[PDB]
Amino acid sequence: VHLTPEEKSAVTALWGKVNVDEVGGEALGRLLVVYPWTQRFFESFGDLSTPDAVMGNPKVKAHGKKVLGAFSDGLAHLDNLKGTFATLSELHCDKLHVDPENFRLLGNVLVCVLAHHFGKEFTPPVQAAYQKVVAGVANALAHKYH
Amino acid sequence: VHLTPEEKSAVTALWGKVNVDEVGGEALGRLLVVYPWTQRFFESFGDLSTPDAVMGNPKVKAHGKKVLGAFSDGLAHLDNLKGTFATLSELHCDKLHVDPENFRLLGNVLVCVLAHHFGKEFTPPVQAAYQKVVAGVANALAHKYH
Amino acid sequence: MLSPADKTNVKAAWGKVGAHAGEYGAEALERMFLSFPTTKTAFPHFDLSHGSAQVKGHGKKVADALTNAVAHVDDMPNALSALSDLHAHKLRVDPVNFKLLSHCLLVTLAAHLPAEFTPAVHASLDKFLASVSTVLTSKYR
Amino acid sequence: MLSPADKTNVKAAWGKVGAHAGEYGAEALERMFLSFPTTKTAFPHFDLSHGSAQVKGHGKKVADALTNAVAHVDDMPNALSALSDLHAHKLRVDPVNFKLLSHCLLVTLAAHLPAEFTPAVHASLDKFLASVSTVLTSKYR
Ligand code: HEM
Ligand code: HEM
Numbered sequence: 001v002h003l004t005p006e007e008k009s010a011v012t013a014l015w016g017k018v019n020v021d022e023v024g025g026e027a028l029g030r031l032l033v034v035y036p037w038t039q040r041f042f043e044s045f046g047d048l049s050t051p052d053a054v055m056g057n058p059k060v061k062a063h064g065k066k067v068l069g070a071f072s073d074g075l076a077h078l079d080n081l082k083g084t085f086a087t088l089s090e091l092h093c094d095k096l097h098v099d100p101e102n103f104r105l106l107g108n109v110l111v112c113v114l115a116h117h118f119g120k121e122f123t124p125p126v127q128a129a130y131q132k133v134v135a136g137v138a139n140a141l142a143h144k145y146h
Numbered sequence: 147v148h149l150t151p152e153e154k155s156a157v158t159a160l161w162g163k164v165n166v167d168e169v170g171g172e173a174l175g176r177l178l179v180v181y182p183w184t185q186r187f188f189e190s191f192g193d194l195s196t197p198d199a200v201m202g203n204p205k206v207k208a209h210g211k212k213v214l215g216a217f218s219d220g221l222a223h224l225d226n227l228k229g230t231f232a233t234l235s236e237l238h239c240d241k242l243h244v245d246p247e248n249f250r251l252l253g254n255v256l257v258c259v260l261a262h263h264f265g266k267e268f269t270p271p272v273q274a275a276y277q278k279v280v281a282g283v284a285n286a287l288a289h290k291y292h
Numbered sequence: 293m294l295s296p297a298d299k300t301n302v303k304a305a306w307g308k309v310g311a312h313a314g315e316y317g318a319e320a321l322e323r324m325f326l327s328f329p330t331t332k333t334a335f336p337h338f339d340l341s342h343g344s345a346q347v348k349g350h351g352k353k354v355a356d357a358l359t360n361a362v363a364h365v366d367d368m369p370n371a372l373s374a375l376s377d378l379h380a381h382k383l384r385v386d387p388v389n390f391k392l393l394s395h396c397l398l399v400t401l402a403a404h405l406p407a408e409f410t411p412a413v414h415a416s417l418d419k420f421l422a423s424v425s426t427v428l429t430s431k432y433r
Numbered sequence: 434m435l436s437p438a439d440k441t442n443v444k445a446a447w448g449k450v451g452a453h454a455g456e457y458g459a460e461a462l463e464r465m466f467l468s469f470p471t472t473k474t475a476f477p478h479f480d481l482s483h484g485s486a487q488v489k490g491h492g493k494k495v496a497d498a499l500t501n502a503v504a505h506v507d508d509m510p511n512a513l514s515a516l517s518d519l520h521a522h523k524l525r526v527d528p529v530n531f532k533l534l535s536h537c538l539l540v541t542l543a544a545h546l547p548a549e550f551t552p553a554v555h556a557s558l559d560k561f562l563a564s565v566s567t568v569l570t571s572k573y574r
C-alpha cells in the first residue's frame with residue numbers, strides 16, 4: 001500500500017500509543033458481538049452468547065493479542081504486505097478455512113476501536129490512513145486463497 | 147490480470163465469435179433494465195422508462211458499441227489493462243462522475259449475456275476466465291479515481 | 293418488492309427449468325467454486341471436483357428449496373423458515389456469498405433458457421434471488 | 434430486525450448526541466469522502482473542501498432524518514417514505530455507498546461517545562443504520 005509520508009507518520013505515531021493486548025481483545029470481541037456469525041470459528045472458546053460473556057472470555061482476549069501482534073509487525077513492512085503475510089494467508093485458506101470477508105470486517109471494527117479509544121485525536125485524515133492500512137492487510141491475507 | 151495461457155486462449159477463442167455491436171447494445175441495455183438506477187447517467191439519451199424503450203433506444207445501442215469496442219481492445223493487452231484504460235479511468239472519474247461499482251455490475255451483465263448467447267459452450271472454466279477479465283477491467287477503470 | 297409481473301416471470305422461467313432443477317443447481321455450484329474460489333471455504337468437508345457426489349447432492353437440495361420458494365413466493369419467510377434458522381444459527385456462511393451464488397444461478401439459467409431469458413425476465417430473476425437471499429440471512433443477528 | 438434492547442440502545446445513544454447531531458453528520462460525511470474517495474462521485478456539484486457549508490448543511494439534513502427515524506423506529510418505512518422515493522427515483526445513489534456512510538457515522542459516534550459506545554450499543558447502532566439503509570434502498574427496482 002502506498003501511504004504518503006504524512007500518512008506514514010500519522011499511522012506510526014498513533015500506533016506507538018496503542019496497547020496491543022487491550023486493543024486486540026476489544027477488536028476481536030466487538031467483532032464477535034457485532035457480527036455473531038464470526039463466532040463459528042471459535043466454538044472451542046466457550047459460551048459466546050452475550051456481549052458480557054464475549055468481552056470477558058480469556059480465550060478471546062488471548063487470540064486478539066495474537067492477531068493484532070501479527071498486524072503490528074505488518075506496520076513495519078507497509079511496502080511489502082503480500083510477502084509479509086503470505087504464510088498466514090495460506091494458513092487461513094488451507095487450514096482455518098476463514099472467508100476473507102472476515103478480515104475486512106475486522107479492519108472496520110478496529111477503526112471504530114481506535115476512534116473510541118483516541119477520541120478527537122483520531123481525525124478524518126488519520127482515519128483515512130488507517131483505512132488504507134486495514135484494506136491493504138486484508139488484501140494481503142486474502143492473496144494466497146485458491 | 148493473471149490468466150493462464152489456457153485461460154487466455156479460451157477467452158480469445160470465444161471473443162472471435164462475438165458480434166461486438168450486437169453484444170454491446172444488449173449488455174448496456176440489460177444493465178439499465180436490471181439495475182434501473184444506472185439510468186441516471188443517461189438522461190440525455192431519451193426515454194428509458196420501460197424495458198422496451200431501453201432496449202429499442204438507438205443511443206443506448208450506439209453507446210454500447212463504443213463501450214464494448216473499448217473492452218475488446220483491452221483483451222489484446224490483458225497483461226497491461228491499467229495502461230490501456232488510464233485515460234478512460236480519469237475520464238470516468240473527473241468528467242463523468244461514474245461510481246466504479248457500475249463497472250462491476252456491467253461486468254456481471256456481460257457474463258450473463260455471453261452465457262445466454264453461447265449456451266453450453268460457455269462452460270464453467272470459460273466463465274471463470276471471463277470473470278477474471280471483467281474484474282480486471284473494472285479495477286483498471288477505477289485505478290485513477292481520487 | 294416483487295411485482296405481479298415479477299412473480300409471473302419467475303414462475304414461467306422456473307417452470308421451464310422443471311425436471312432439470314437439480315442438474316442446474318449443481319452446475320451453479322461448480323460455476324461458483326471455479327469463479328469465486330473464496331466460496332470454497334464454506335465447504336471444507338466436500339469433494340469439489342467436477343461431478344462429485346457431494347456437489348451433485350447439494351445442488352439438488354438447493355434447487356428443491358428454490359422450487360419451494362417459487363411456489364410460496366407470497367409467503368417466503370414462512371416457507372423458508374427452517375433454512376433461515378439453519379443458516380443463521382448453524383452454518384453461518386457470511387452474507388456476501390449469497391450474491392455470488394445468486395449470480396451463478398442466473399448465469400446457469402441464461403445458459404439453458406435461450407428463448408425465456410429476456411431482459412425483463414433477467415430483471416425478475418435477479419430480484420427474486422435477492423429476495424430469497426434476504427430471507428435466508430434475515431435471522432443472522 | 435431490531436429487538437427492543439436494540440431500540441432502547443439506539444434511543445439512548447442518539448439522545449446523548451442531541452444538539453450535536455448536525456455537527457456529527459457533517460464530520461461523518463467528511464470522514465467518508467477522505468476515506469472512500471469514490472463516494473465523491475455522488476456530490477459533483479458540492480464544494481467538498483474542509484469546512485464546506487454545503488457539507489455542513491447536508492450533514493444537518495442527514496442528521497435530522499436519522500433523528501426522525503429513531504423517533505419512529507417502529508414504523509421507519511412510512512416515516513422515511515419521502516426520502517426513499519427521492520433516493521430511488523431522483524438521486525439514484527449506488528447502494529454500496531450506504532454501507533460506507535454507515536461505517537463512518539459509527540466511527541463518528543465512537544469518537545464522541547467514549548462512555549456510551551459499548552460493544553452492545555455498537556452492535557445495535559450497526560443494525561439500526563443497516564435497517565435505515567435497507568429502507569432507503571427499498572424502492573430502487
Ligand atoms: C488482521 C487480520 C488477522 C491476522 C493478522 C491474523 C493472524 C493470526 C495469527 C498470527 C494466527 C496464529 C497462527 C498460528 O498458530 O500459527 C491466527 C490464527 C487464527 N485466526 Fe487469524 N488473523 C486475522 C484475522 C482473523 C479473523 C478475522 C478471523 C475469523 C473471524 C481469524 C480466525 C483465526 C482462527 C480461527 C485462528 C486459529 C486459532 C487457534 O488455533 O486457536 N483470524 N490468526
Ligand atoms: C467495461 C466498462 C466500460 C468501458 C470500457 C467504457 C468505455 C467508454 C468509452 C470508450 C466512452 C467514450 C469516451 C469518449 O470518447 O467520450 C465512454 C463514455 C461514457 N461512459 Fe463508459 N465504459 C464502461 C462502463 C460504463 C458504465 C458501467 C457506465 C455507467 C453506468 C458508463 C458511463 C459512461 C457515460 C455516461 C459516458 C459518456 C456518454 C456520452 O457521451 O454521453 N460507462 N465509456
Ligand code: HEM
Binds near residue numbers: 331334354375389
Ligand atoms: C440460493 C440460496 C441458498 C439456498 C436456497 C440454500 C439452501 C440450502 C439447503 C436446502 C441446504 C441443505 C439443508 C439440509 O441439510 O437439509 C443447505 C445447506 C448448506 N448451505 Fe445453503 N443455500 C443457499 C446458499 C448458500 C450459500 C451461499 C452457501 C455458502 C457458500 C451455503 C452453504 C451451505 C452449506 C455449507 C450447507 C451444508 C451442506 C452439508 O453440510 O451437507 N448455502 N443450503
Ligand code: HEM
Binds near residue numbers: 516524534
Ligand atoms: C443514513 C443514510 C442517509 C440518509 C438518512 C440520507 C438523507 C438525506 C436527506 C434528508 C436528504 C435531503 C433531501 C432534501 O433535502 O429534501 C438527502 C439528499 C441527498 N443524499 Fe441522502 N441520505 C443518506 C445517505 C446518502 C448517501 C449514502 C448518499 C451517497 C453517498 C446520499 C446522497 C445524497 C445526495 C447527493 C443528496 C442531495 C444533496 C443536495 O443536492 O443537496 N445520501 N439525503
